[PDB]
Amino acid sequence: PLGSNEEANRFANQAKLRVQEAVFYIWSDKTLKYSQMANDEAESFRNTWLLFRSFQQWITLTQTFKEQSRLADQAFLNKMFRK
Amino acid sequence: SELLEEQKQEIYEAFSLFDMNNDGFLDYHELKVAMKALGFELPKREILDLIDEYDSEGRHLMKYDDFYIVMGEKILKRDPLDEIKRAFQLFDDDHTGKISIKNLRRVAKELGETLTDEELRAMIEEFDLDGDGEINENEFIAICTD
Amino acid sequence: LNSELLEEQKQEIYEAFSLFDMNNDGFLDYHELKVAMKALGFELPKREILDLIDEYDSEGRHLMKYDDFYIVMGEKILKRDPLDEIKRAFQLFDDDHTGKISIKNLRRVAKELGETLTDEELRAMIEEFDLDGDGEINENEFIAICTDS
Amino acid sequence: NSELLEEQKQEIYEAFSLFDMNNDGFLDYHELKVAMKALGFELPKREILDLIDEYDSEGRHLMKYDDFYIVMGEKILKRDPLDEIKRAFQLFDDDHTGKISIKNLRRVAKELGAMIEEFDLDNENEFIAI
Ligand SMILES: [Ca+2]
Ligand SMILES: [Ca+2]
Ligand SMILES: [Ca+2]
Ligand SMILES: [Ca+2]
Ligand SMILES: [Ca+2]
Ligand SMILES: [Ca+2]
Ligand SMILES: [Ca+2]
Numbered sequence: 482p483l484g485s486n487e488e489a490n491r492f493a494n495q496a497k498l499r500v501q502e503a504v505f506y507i508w509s510d511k512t513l514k515y516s517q518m519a520n521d522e523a524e525s526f527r528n529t530w531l532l533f534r535s536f537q538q539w540i541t542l543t544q545t546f547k548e549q550s551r552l553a554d555q556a557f558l559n560k561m562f563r564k
Numbered sequence: 565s566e567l568l569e570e571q572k573q574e575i576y577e578a579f580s581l582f583d584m585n586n587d588g589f590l591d592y593h594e595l596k597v598a599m600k601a602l603g604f605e606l607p608k609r610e611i612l613d614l615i616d617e618y619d620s621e622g623r624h625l626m627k628y629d630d631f632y633i634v635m636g637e638k639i640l641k642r643d644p645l646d647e648i649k650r651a652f653q654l655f656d657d658d659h660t661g662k663i664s665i666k667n668l669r670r671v672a673k674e675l676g677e678t679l680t681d682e683e684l685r686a687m688i689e690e691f692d693l694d695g696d697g698e699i700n701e702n703e704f705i706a707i708c709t710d
Numbered sequence: 711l712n713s714e715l716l717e718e719q720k721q722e723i724y725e726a727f728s729l730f731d732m733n734n735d736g737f738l739d740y741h742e743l744k745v746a747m748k749a750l751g752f753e754l755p756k757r758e759i760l761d762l763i764d765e766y767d768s769e770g771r772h773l774m775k776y777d778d779f780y781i782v783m784g785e786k787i788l789k790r791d792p793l794d795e796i797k798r799a800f801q802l803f804d805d806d807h808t809g810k811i812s813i814k815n816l817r818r819v820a821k822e823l824g825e826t827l828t829d830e831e832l833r834a835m836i837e838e839f840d841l842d843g844d845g846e847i848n849e850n851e852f853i854a855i856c857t858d859s
Numbered sequence: 860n861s862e863l864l865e866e867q868k869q870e871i872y873e874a875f876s877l878f879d880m881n882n883d884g885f886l887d888y889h890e891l892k893v894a895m896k897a898l899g900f901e902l903p904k905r906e907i908l909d910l911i912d913e914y915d916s917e918g919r920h921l922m923k924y925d926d927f928y929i930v931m932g933e934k935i936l937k938r939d940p941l942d943e944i945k946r947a948f949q950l951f952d953d954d955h956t957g958k959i960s961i962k963n964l965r966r967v968a969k970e971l972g973a974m975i976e977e978f979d980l981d982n983e984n985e986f987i988a989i
Pocket of ligand 7: 879882883884885886887890
């Protein structure tokens with residue numbers, strides 16, 4: 482109704498926008514968050530693995546000493562066993 | 565090889581608007597703007613090359629059927645990188661060949677966004693791969709490529 | 711290769727690479743690699759990270775394959791000071807920062823690792839290594855649990 | 860204290876040898892604690908550390924076999940030969956019943972791999988006679 486075909490240029494500024502947001506979002510919204518997101522998943526990994534290593538070292542030793550201990554008494558009888 | 569629905573629509577959407585007189589044809593005048601909307605800036609005489617080529621009378625008008633094909637094949641021969649390269653320039657308003665803090669500061673507000681300078685600093689600091697605190701073209705291409 | 715890596719350490723490298731391959735091509739770009747290094751506790755300066763991928767690429771592009779990750783890290787880990795690592799593991803047990811791993815502590819860890827243990831057993835663990843006799847494990851006691859075996 | 864008997868001489872060696880877990884010719888607390896259970900000795904936590912403290916003139920909390928030999932040696936001879944017996948009895952008695960039954964004996968027989976009434980008069984008293 483009103484206005485010219487400078488509006489063709491009011492349509493470029495707008496097309497350049499649908500693309501600005503497009504690339505701005507894949508940059509930020511998508512891509513840059515993974516810098517925080519996986520940065521956390523990284524800590525959580527480190528952490529979990531750190532725990533696991535120490536805990537597995539702890540518990541298996543306990544298991545061995547129990548298991549050894551109950552073999553020491555076993556052993557101690559084996560002398561008196563043969564009367 | 566085949567146009568996306570977004571692409572197909574674009575063509576139609578453009579040829580629809582710059583057809584001032586609804587009449588179904590675009591004259592030279594109408595075409596020049598049509599192609600500049602779709603992103604193309606051809607030499608004025610090359611636009612006339614087109615009209616005349618696809619024009620079986622001394623009429624000087626282009627049918628939609630012909631626009632679609634001409635534009636269509638002009639869209640596919642599009643270099644993927646040209647789009648990316650022409651994307652950089654919209655951020656680099658100053659045209660320094662490097663994307664700045666204040667550059668993005670201008671984008672974010674223009675895209676209706678509230679983000680601290682740490683949020684923005686974070687965005688650059690991550691992709692700045694030489695240490696100058698700013699994104700040159702290669703790095704920007706990278707951001708985009710997969 | 712050398713001083714053979716621990717079964718727990720192999721799984722470290724694998725799991726890390728497997729988890730940060732954001733796509734699963736068997737490859738890692740700078741970004742994919744930076745976090746993967748944090749996960750093995752190896753935060754490097756940016757420069758040297760780029761330096762590293764380059765070093766490992768005659769094939770042009772900017773990546774790293776498991777094959778070589780598995781090794782760079784392999785020696786990165788060996789070079790590792792064992793004492794700082796234990797010290798760090800201690801802190802994680804001690805959520806409440808009391809200076810000693812209590813049984814509430816140990817239980818929390820043990821649930822966190824999806825183990826199910828009877829409290830009689832948690833107390834068994836603590837007792838065997840509680841040399842100062844106060845029924846919790848302090849730093850020096852923990853170190854000794856992890857010292858070598 | 861006498862010249863320590865050969866039969867017991869080996870038992871000492873066997874103890875030390877059999878229970879050096881990491882196999883570094885020394886015992887540390889944990890190993891030492893199990894090592895002595897093989898010779899019947901079950902000492903207070905405090906006590907054990909005490910020993911390691913005494914003979915670890917080495918520094919860094921270990922025990923050389925020589926020291927170990929010296930110690931357990933006196934302990935074996937200077938031990939109430941009936942306390943020796945007492946612990947043995949306490950060990951067959953899983954269920955802490957007071958009398959050893961076969962579920963506390965085959966328990967041992969099996970746990971190492973006829974004449975039921977052999978030494979039965981029906982306890983700790985019948986024990987020492989063997
Ligand atoms: Ca028209
Ligand atoms: Ca700029
Ligand atoms: Ca740069
Ligand atoms: Ca990948
Ligand atoms: Ca605590
Ligand atoms: Ca303690
Ligand atoms: Ca040892």
